[PDB]
Ligand binder design. Structure first.
Ligand SMILES: [Ca+2]
Length: 86
């Protein structure tokens, strides 16, 4: 099995309470399909949406992780940052 490629499309920028549109566009699996997307927004929150919208209550730089899992149950993880300013 080839592991899937997740594409997390960072880096991200926004202000406090701004709904940041996260995108996994360009993720693929060479020899099957991606069946799940798991996001960790770095503030303790997660999502299983393919392209979640998420806002951050407070200024900061958050580590964002995207785990993609293919039809064989194997996964790969990629990371970026979201920089949230005043
Ligand atoms: Ca695969």
């Amino acid at each position: 099995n080839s592991l899937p490629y997740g594409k997390i499309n960072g880096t991200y920028k926004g202000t406090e309470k701004e709904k940041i549109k996260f995108s996994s566009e360009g993720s693929f699996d060479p020899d099957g399909k991606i069946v799940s997307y798991e996001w960790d927004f770095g503030d303790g929150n997660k999502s299983n949406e393919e392209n979640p919208e998420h806002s951050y209550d407070k200024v900061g730089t958050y580590t964002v992780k995207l785990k993609v899992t293919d039809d064989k149950g194997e996964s790969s993880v990629s990371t970026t940052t979201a920089e949230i300013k005043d």
